Each structure stands twice: as structure tokens, then as C-alpha cells.
């Protein structure tokens, strides 16, 4: 409500930075999930052996 041009640009930049950080966090979570899947299949193979 009545921020002005400079405040709007600062808010947009902050929102974009937060989006980038949270996208990085999502990528990290996906990597963790992939590592969990690999660990599961390796543990199954080791138990079978």
C-alpha cells in the first residue's frame, strides 16, 4: 500500500532471492530422496548377498 517504485523493486528482488534459495532447498531435498532410494536398493542387495 503506497510503497513506491524503489520499495517495489527491493521487494521484487527479495522475493526472487527467496525463490532462488527455496528452489535450491527443493533441489537438495530431491538429491536426498535420490540418495535414500540408492541406499535402499544397496541395502537390499547387501542383505541378499
Amino acid at each position: 500500500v503506497g510503497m513506491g517504485a524503489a520499495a517495489l523493486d527491493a521487494l521484487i528482488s527479495g522475493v526472487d532471492a527467496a525463490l532462488t534459495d527455496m528452489t535450491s532447498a527443493a533441489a537438495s531435498l530431491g538429491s536426498i530422496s535420490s540418495r535414500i532410494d540408492l541406499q535402499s536398493e544397496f541395502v537390499n542387495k547387501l542383505s541378499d548377498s
Binding site: 526472487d16 525463490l19 532462488t20 528452489t23
Partner: protein
């Protein structure tokens, strides 16, 4: 994901561009009307000299 976000931003910019084009068109129509009226005024005055 970053490029999809940028695409959404570009769509918003497209909507803003349409709004601004409408504003400029209205202002330019008003400008033509004012120019025609002032030309008529000048013609009347040079007749009245």
C-alpha cells in the same frame, strides 16, 4: 523453474504493456481533439483580426 518464473513475469509485463498502450491511446486521442479545437480557435482569431 527459474525460466518458468521469468515467463510468468513476462506475461505480467505483457498485461502491463497492454494497459499502458490503452492509456497512451486515450491520451493521444485527447491530444488530437485538443489540437483540432486549438486550430479552430486560431482560424477564428485570424478571421477576427
Amino acid at each position: 523453474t527459474t525460466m518458468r518464473s521469468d515467463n510468468q513475469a513476462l506475461s505480467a509485463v505483457q498485461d502491463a504493456l497492454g494497459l499502458g498502450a490503452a492509456k497512451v491511446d486515450t491520451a493521444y486521442s485527447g491530444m488530437e481533439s485538443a489540437i483540432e479545437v486549438v486550430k479552430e480557435i486560431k482560424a477564428k482569431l485570424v478571421a477576427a483580426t
